[PDB]
Amino acid sequence: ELQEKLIAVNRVSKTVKGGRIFSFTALTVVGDGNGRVGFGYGKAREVPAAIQKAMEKARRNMINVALNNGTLQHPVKGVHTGSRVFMQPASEGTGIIAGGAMRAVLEVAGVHNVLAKAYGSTNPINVVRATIDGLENMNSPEMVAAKRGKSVEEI
Amino acid sequence: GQKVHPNGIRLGIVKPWNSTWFANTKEFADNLDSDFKVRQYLTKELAKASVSRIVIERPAKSIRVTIHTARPGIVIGKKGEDVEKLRKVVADIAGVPAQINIAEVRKPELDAKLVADSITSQLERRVMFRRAMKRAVQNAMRLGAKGIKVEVSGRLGGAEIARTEWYREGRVPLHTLRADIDYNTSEAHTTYGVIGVKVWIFKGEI
Amino acid sequence: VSMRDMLKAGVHFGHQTRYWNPKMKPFIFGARNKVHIINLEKTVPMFNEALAELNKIASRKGKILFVGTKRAASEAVKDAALSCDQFFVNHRWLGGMLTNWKTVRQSIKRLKDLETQSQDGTFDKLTKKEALMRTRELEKLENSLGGIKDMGGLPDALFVIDADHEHIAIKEANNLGIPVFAIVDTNSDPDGVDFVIPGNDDAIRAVTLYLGAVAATVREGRSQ
RNA sequence: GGCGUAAAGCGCACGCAGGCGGUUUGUUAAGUCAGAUGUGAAAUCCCCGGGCUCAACCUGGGAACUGCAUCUGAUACUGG
RNA sequence: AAGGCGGCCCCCUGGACGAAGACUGACGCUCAGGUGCGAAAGCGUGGGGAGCAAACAGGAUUAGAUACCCUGGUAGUCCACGCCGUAAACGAUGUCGACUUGGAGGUUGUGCCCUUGAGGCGUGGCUUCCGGAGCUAACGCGUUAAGUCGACCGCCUGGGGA
RNA sequence: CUGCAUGGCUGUCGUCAGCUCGUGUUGUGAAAUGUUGGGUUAAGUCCCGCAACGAGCGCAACCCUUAUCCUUUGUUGCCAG
RNA sequence: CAGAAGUGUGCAGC
Numbered sequence A: 001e002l003q004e005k006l007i008a009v010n011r012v013s014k015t016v017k018g019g020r021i022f023s024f025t026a027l028t029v030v031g032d033g034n035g036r037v038g039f040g041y042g043k044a045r046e047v048p049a050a051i052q053k054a055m056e057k058a059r060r061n062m063i064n065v066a067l068n069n070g071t072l073q074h075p076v077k078g079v080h081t082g083s084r085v086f087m088q089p090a091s092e093g094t095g096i097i098a099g100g101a102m103r104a105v106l107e108v109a110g111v112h113n114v115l116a117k118a119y120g121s122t123n124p125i126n127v128v129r130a131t132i133d134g135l136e137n138m139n140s141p142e143m144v145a146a147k148r149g150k151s152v153e154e155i
Numbered sequence B: 001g002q003k004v005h006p007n008g009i010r011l012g013i014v015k016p017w018n019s020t021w022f023a024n025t026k027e028f029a030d031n032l033d034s035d036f037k038v039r040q041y042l043t044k045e046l047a048k049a050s051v052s053r054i055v056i057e058r059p060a061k062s063i064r065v066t067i068h069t070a071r072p073g074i075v076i077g078k079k080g081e082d083v084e085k086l087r088k089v090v091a092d093i094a095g096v097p098a099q100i101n102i103a104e105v106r107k108p109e110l111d112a113k114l115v116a117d118s119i120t121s122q123l124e125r126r127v128m129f130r131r132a133m134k135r136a137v138q139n140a141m142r143l144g145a146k147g148i149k150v151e152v153s154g155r156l157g158g159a160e161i162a163r164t165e166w167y168r169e170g171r172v173p174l175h176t177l178r179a180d181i182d183y184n185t186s187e188a189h190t191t192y193g194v195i196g197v198k199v200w201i202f203k204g205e206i
Numbered sequence C: 001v002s003m004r005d006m007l008k009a010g011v012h013f014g015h016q017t018r019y020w021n022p023k024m025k026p027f028i029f030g031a032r033n034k035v036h037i038i039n040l041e042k043t044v045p046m047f048n049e050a051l052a053e054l055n056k057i058a059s060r061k062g063k064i065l066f067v068g069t070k071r072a073a074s075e076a077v078k079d080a081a082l083s084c085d086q087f088f089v090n091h092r093w094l095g096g097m098l099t100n101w102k103t104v105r106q107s108i109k110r111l112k113d114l115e116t117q118s119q120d121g122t123f124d125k126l127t128k129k130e131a132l133m134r135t136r137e138l139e140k141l142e143n144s145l146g147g148i149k150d151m152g153g154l155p156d157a158l159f160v161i162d163a164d165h166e167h168i169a170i171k172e173a174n175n176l177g178i179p180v181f182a183i184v185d186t187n188s189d190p191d192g193v194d195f196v197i198p199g200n201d202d203a204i205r206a207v208t209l210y211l212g213a214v215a216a217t218v219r220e221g222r223s224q
Numbered sequence D: 001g002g003c004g005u006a007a008a009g010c011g012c013a014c015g016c017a018g019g020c021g022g023u024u025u026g027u028u029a030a031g032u033c034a035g036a037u038g039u040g041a042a043a044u045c046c047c048c049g050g051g052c053u054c055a056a057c058c059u060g061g062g063a064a065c066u067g068c069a070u071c072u073g074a075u076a077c078u079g080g
Numbered sequence E: 001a002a003g004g005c006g007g008c009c010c011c012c013u014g015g016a017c018g019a020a021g022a023c024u025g026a027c028g029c030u031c032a033g034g035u036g037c038g039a040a041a042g043c044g045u046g047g048g049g050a051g052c053a054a055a056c057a058g059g060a061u062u063a064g065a066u067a068c069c070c071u072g073g074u075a076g077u078c079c080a081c082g083c084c085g086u087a088a089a090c091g092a093u094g095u096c097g098a099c100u101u102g103g104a105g106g107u108u109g110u111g112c113c114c115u116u117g118a119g120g121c122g123u124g125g126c127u128u129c130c131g132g133a134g135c136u137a138a139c140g141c142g143u144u145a146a147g148u149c150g151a152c153c154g155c156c157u158g159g160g161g162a
Numbered sequence F: 001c002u003g004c005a006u007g008g009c010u011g012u013c014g015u016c017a018g019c020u021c022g023u024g025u026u027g028u029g030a031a032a033u034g035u036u037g038g039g040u041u042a043a044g045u046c047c048c049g050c051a052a053c054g055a056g057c058g059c060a061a062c063c064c065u066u067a068u069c070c071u072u073u074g075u076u077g078c079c080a081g
Numbered sequence G: 001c002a003g004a005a006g007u008g009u010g011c012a013g014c
């Protein structure tokens, strides 16, 4: 069911009386395809332990996005901290035109056709935040109609 | 800093001696020397037979040797044809007539010596040390040790600067004299030099 | 329940205007002597609805957890909870009592095994110092956990006496997605609560009225 | 795209030229919008097809030439 | 307006705010260039000179001590009339207008209520401290915004060189 | 020859009272909390409180010796009667 | 009350 991606591994460190303790952090994402995704950030003193924590965090903390038969409903702008993300739907056979950190998220979401651009900070954590924020804001014709009370013939 | 050797501090409290004989100062040193020679021989001989331990007892101006091994049939030999050779060569080394007994170590995964030798062999097979350590700890715990820790030291992975790396699971109270801490050490002679492996296994108090 | 019962209980008395929360503004009738008065004719229908959904989940044989921590209220909370065979926390709420349930269950099983060895195990076999310290352990475990010792899992709903005092329990329940029913006073923030019951959270007779109606509805639904 | 602390608010104020303008009615039709006509050289660049043994090259037709200009309409907004 | 303004009295004089109306009828906002004001130190001419005090002298301290400390002490500090035009000239936050949960205080008007008071309830101006949504890299800001918007102006584009 | 390529062993801060981990929670994050707070101890020793709940290595105890007694045996040791 | 200075240059722990 779930597809899983490892986006990044980073060695952080704490200074202490005796010297330096090195610790590993891992950023991963999981998703069903079909517009369900989550991300998980794990910490450990060992790389595989960090990855397992990340996956376990990413199986909860999981959100639904109303995909438009494998593309976006409309262009969206997402932002988090210093990272700004623009995404736009694309014709069939466009593929995923995105950077690695966004490509992972969009792949596990199952958005086959997208144009995307990162602006400002490309820091993977905040980029993933901004992308999830954007996908979470995206909305679809049926619930737009429900809000405005029109029939979907309004499309 | 340094720690006391955990077996020696427990001798007579909970751990028995591996040699048991009485001698006057005259023959004491010769007994100790011939015991050393027989131990060295048997260790060199049975290196693949998973010999855990050798106990030497000198009754009635005789020597008898008990060998604890996790692979008895290899040491005994078919129809016992091998213990004949061992006992004859031991009688040659010790001079006194020799008897050999063999005992099964049922669960070598709970034996610090056999675990240390296993890790050492795997390291010489160029296995990743992380995997060897993790496998050892996990097997010991699943077979019911009250705790374990393992340590490996020096030029790990061919690194240019030596490290020590250690991993611990469960409880391991080295200061508790009641604790039957089994302990052992082994050395892997890689192309980069000596890697030192230490193993502690805790099986409960008293 | 009727508005005269709530007036008898004094549930309409809010807090001083200094300490009001503007989010409660819709539930305030006004002020007297610069003290806020809770609107009872809003409270009553909301409380009836809360009891209706409580009854619904009770008929599903759901497990209710009552939560209060306050000097006098704790005992009425325990009494009512046991009166409906439901579970309770009446001393300090442990941080993580639900979101970290996978840990706290160890202390519960510890309490069970300690009681069993205390009563059936011939606890007198111990030394006097050991018996003393293990009995004090038993005492502290009783105080903290006895009301949930048999819950065997997460509750199906929380009933809370004071959303401002017990905000930890509310936030944990929200995190787990469990419905929270709570009495909410003019200083509280309601946004964590699914079934707000606006009313005084301090008058022991008000607490008695609320717990009584709750436990009656629970017994009703259980009898199905 | 920025200007509390990373580079960045004139020390403060008055005030000419300049930019901007509450609300209602009428009128104009400058900005704005619509339609028509002329012009926007060929080549090059796109699409559909021909010819070199293929290709690079050559070539037919189309589209485009994101514009400019002159008439004839609309008057919501902006300007008079 | 900012720089700033502190014993008491008189003369001349600017602005702000509140209540109630009456009046004119878009007359408004911002502002390149320009013009005015602008702490302290400093400069010119003429006065005054208690205290304080750059420079300078002596005594100490110190390895040295062109300082810190001590004893003295000149310009200056004060006054009149000119010049200079800079400051961490700071809220390190341009001016103007609208909108958006609250709490505790200060100061100054004014309305109503038995005014009974050292009283209750309303309504304006300015100002101090917390804190919500929201915003922010974070610190924090938070109806006196660093929130949501509009008009105009000034300014920035890696560190040194500068 | 290389202790600055290593194992083993050892000194030292120091027999100082500290050092960490799991799960939960807070923060974009490095991290934080727990381990901090009021008392107390030789001591992160113990008790109350507290978004923390538990655990591990340390402290303590188990070990040897010394200060009192009692049972048993009584030579090569002892000598009350 | 007095108490100044500390040559250059590196390498593991993913």
Ligand SMILES: [K+]
Binding pocket: none
């Ligand atoms: K005046």
Ligand SMILES: [K+]
Binding pocket: none
């Ligand atoms: K100017």
Ligand SMILES: [K+]
Binding pocket: none
């Ligand atoms: K002087």
Ligand SMILES: [K+]
Binding pocket: E062, E063
């Ligand atoms: K000196």
Ligand SMILES: [K+]
Binding pocket: none
């Ligand atoms: K003078």
Ligand SMILES: [K+]
Binding pocket: none
């Ligand atoms: K440069």
Ligand SMILES: [K+]
Binding pocket: none
């Ligand atoms: K060494």
Ligand SMILES: [K+]
Binding pocket: none
């Ligand atoms: K943690």
Ligand SMILES: [Mg+2]
Binding pocket: A120, A121
């Ligand atoms: Mg950049």
Ligand SMILES: [Mg+2]
Binding pocket: D001, D002
């Ligand atoms: Mg920039």
Ligand SMILES: [Mg+2]
Binding pocket: none
């Ligand atoms: Mg600076």
Ligand SMILES: [Mg+2]
Binding pocket: none
């Ligand atoms: Mg700056």
Ligand SMILES: [Mg+2]
Binding pocket: none
């Ligand atoms: Mg300014």
Ligand SMILES: [Mg+2]
Binding pocket: none
């Ligand atoms: Mg002006």
Ligand SMILES: [Mg+2]
Binding pocket: D016
């Ligand atoms: Mg002008």
Ligand SMILES: [Mg+2]
Binding pocket: none
């Ligand atoms: Mg003008």
